[PDB]
Structure 1
């Protein structure tokens, strides 16, 4: 009883800390960038604290462009273009009339296609519109030549491209500059005369015009808002309606209107640093319901732009109003290509004509800092950056709570010399290298990382390795727990009523546990599912939890029991 009652009291206080932390864990890019209202832009990127700053990127593994391509490069005298297709681990290199597509992972699967007589000018990949093609046709390759648009089916056994195009249509003597698509398989093309066109197909295909050559079409299939940009920095916003089959222009802003508003906001900057506008990019709602556009300037001015009034999540796009301007570190110059993903911004700059510098900034270091901080670094890369893509893998809490299950993240950069993969190391791999260099669980750098991450979270990230089981860490392990024992501090009674501050260890293990499972601390044990068994609806009560995830959760819990046990005697 008194035992069981104290146990209930425990589980309760535990869940109390757990809900406290999870609530904090839901806690926006808006409330990050300190922009109070949809109309009240602010700026960051000027004070050293914003960049108050331990390897952050993995060391680059190179990979040479497969020899066959360095061979064929002798025959391209008209033109050449190279793009990266992430979803299929592929690169596409068009010589004037022909396409070559290779396995960008290791240079295999060189497939060629020479069925075009005139110069291919733009290329697109499309996931086919549901049920329109038979099931072997995984994707559609759209090619754009000075005369026409050609649609070829692409099946996958091995890269299998159908030799006969699935469709042909006239480009109307209008050079197609960019090919793009939204999730449901709508095909958009950018006409060199700045007109946005749509290729509406069914099971049968037609071009249509819905609308300063527009050179980049960004589609956020998370809100069905199509954002487009002209060479003169014209930014046009079109709503596709809630159902996403619509097309209607809703807003537009000119590069000069931008620069003017800018010089109005940041009174001290030479206004030219605002222009021209090199990149637009959709900031998916998943990270921020508020912001719906990021913009990247040649001098790295980073602009945030919104389309609907703040805290109006159902509104399709209505305006194009800037909210906050991000000034760069220091300094970046000649930015000539870029890519953004999940609080990571990479930009390729022309130091020399054949050597590029890659700058990357990210907000990992202090996901809990008001205002936003970020760590950044630049690295050498051989070649003019022809394309810079990310590999798509399979609000969120921040890494500092989910590191106990999810990988450190991989990014891939493509250059004239080849591929360079790198990894954003979670705080885990940080603590790792900090340990492995000093080669022993003691080191002042350890005192530093400890003071940095607010001892409690430290102790947690310490256990994060202190129970790892694969072989490569057996030694590190014995060290790190030593560390957890040394730098976590000591329990003491804080006399204010007297409040107890459990040592970074206690709350740390608590947080570790909750981070292990957490959501089931309050969630349902069972949920009624309904299956349409023919002409009869069947109610079953199925587990709220699935097996495989439960197996993993167990395994980790077992681990926690193990460490808890091995330390059980040592705490008394």
Structure 2
């Protein structure tokens, strides 16, 4: 589905900042140009632009999140969070299915806005129950937005708190992404230094850091494995995470993607519930075959392949669908996509012969 021409015009009308994004669960895409926002249904052939230009300052992040229960009328399916350099703005959204292809979409103002504060917002994630978490490229702190139905004299309808609190003595480090796992009430952050932090939503408004695992720990774990490799060193970056839900696995909590194309599967255990320890257990090394125009003529562990070097972006979806954006050239991306060999996995016997085919 080609990007509609009316936003290509707006994109080139940009002065300082533009950004694109996806709302795949309702079939909408979006583009921000400075202090303006535009949504459209990409399944539609001649889409109408749903614009929101009330924003005064440059938009830095937008996300589509479930609403908090008992706050809005039932016809509101989602909440649209719009972060600018000045404010975090909440909008009501109804994506009801009128009537043929995608969900007809309407925006509602809420009179809910918080000062952005000193910390940039580039990453917005939401939970099943409508909790909204924020993070960005100023630091590693995680913020949460509360919002309420009532006007109270002592509180406000809309608030923002910092769940991290650092003291003095700081070091430069910021976030690369935020990741929710509702089945375990966990939140994961990934930093630019490839540090993985795990937070537990112990209570309905509480968030608690329970694990911090830096690259060094991952590398020590990796060293104690029978097979070390040049594809994972202290020079290597972790570019993406993908949580694994509790319904898919008990032990393996998280997958981490290196820029050399290695998938690291990390377990996490309680000492007894939130986890307190995280460990690199299993590595899936890259495939060897590179893409070709002409077909080519087709048992030891291959731990040196560079077919996925460099991996810029990475996504994992249950039950193991893997997408890797390989940026071999500065101009065109190649897409590596794999799935579990379900057939061979269920045929394999006995249990000890099972490999990640």
| CA distance in structure 2 between the partners assigned to 1:309 and 1:302 by the alignment | 23
Between structure 1 and structure 2, the one with the greater Rg is 1
> Aligned ranges for residues 211-250 of structure 1 at < 5 Å?
211=164, 212-241=173-202, 245-250=205-210
Tell me which residue corresponds to 2:285.
327
Q: TM-score, normalised by structure 2?
A: 0.80
> Aligned ranges for residues 9-28 of structure 1 at < 5 Å?
none
Q: Residue by residue, what CA displacement relative to the aligned partner does 1:259-315 show, whole Å, maximum 9, x if unpaired?
A: 2332342554124388211111111122112211111111111111122259x8xx4
Tell me which residue corresponds to 2:107.
161
Cα 1:347–1:282, aligned 2, differ >3 Å: closer, same or farther?
A: same
Counterpart selection for 1:306 from 255, 260, 267: 267
| CA distance in structure 1 between the partners assigned to 2:355 and 2:50 by the alignment | 46
Contact 1:366 1:373 in 2 (8 A): no
| CA distance in structure 2 between the partners assigned to 1:210 and 1:179 by the alignment | 15
> Aligned ranges for residues 109-120 of structure 1 at < 5 Å?
109-120=48-59
| CA distance in structure 1 between the partners assigned to 2:278 and 2:34 by the alignment | 38
> Aligned ranges for residues 188-337 of structure 1 at < 5 Å?
188-191=133-136, 192-203=138-149, 204-211=157-164, 212-241=173-202, 245-265=205-225, 267-270=227-230, 271-272=232-233, 275-308=236-269, 315-330=273-288, 331-337=307-313
Q: Which is strand-richer, 1 or 2?
A: 2
Contact 1:97 1:118 in 2 (8 A): yes
For the pair 1:175 / 2:133, whether they are aligned, the reply is no
Tell me which residue corresponds to 2:316.
340
What CA RMSD, in Å, does the superposition of the two structures yield over aligned residues?
2.1
- Give the gaps of 5 or more residues in structure 1: 1-62, 375-572
Q: Which is helix-richer, 1 or 2?
A: 1
Tell me which residue corresponds to 1:139.
78
**Partner secondary structure for residue 59 of structure 2:** coil
For the pair 1:75 / 2:35, whether they are aligned, the reply is no
> Aligned ranges for residues 398-413 of structure 1 at < 5 Å?
none
Q: Residue by residue, what CA displacement relative to the aligned partner does 1:350-378 show, whole Å, maximum 9, x if unpaired?
A: 1323311000121134222433243xxxx
Contact 1:146 1:173 in 2 (8 A): no
Q: TM-score, normalised by structure 1?
A: 0.51
Quote the offset at 1:110 in angstroms: 2.3
Q: Which has the higher contact order (CA 8 A, sep 6+)?
A: 1
| CA distance in structure 2 between the partners assigned to 1:269 and 1:349 by the alignment | 20
Cα 1:373–1:322, aligned 2, differ >3 Å: closer, same or farther?
A: closer
Q: Residue by residue, what CA displacement relative to the aligned partner does 1:137-180 show, whole Å, maximum 9, x if unpaired?
A: 22111111112111111224521112x45311111132112111
- Give the gaps of 5 or more residues in structure 2: 97-103, 150-156, 165-172, 289-306
For the pair 1:127 / 2:85, whether they are aligned, the reply is no
Q: Residue by residue, what CA displacement relative to the aligned partner does 1:406-451 show, whole Å, maximum 9, x if unpaired?
A: xxxxxxxxxxxxxxxxxxxxxxxxxxxxxxxxxxxxxxxxxxxxxx
| CA distance in structure 2 between the partners assigned to 1:268 and 1:324 by the alignment | 12
| CA distance in structure 2 between the partners assigned to 1:77 and 1:352 by the alignment | 28
**Partner secondary structure for residue 269 of structure 2:** coil
Quote the offset at 1:72 in angstroms: 2.0
Counterpart selection for 2:34 from 71, 92, 96: 96
Point out 4+ residue stretches in structure 1 off by more than 4 angstroms.
none
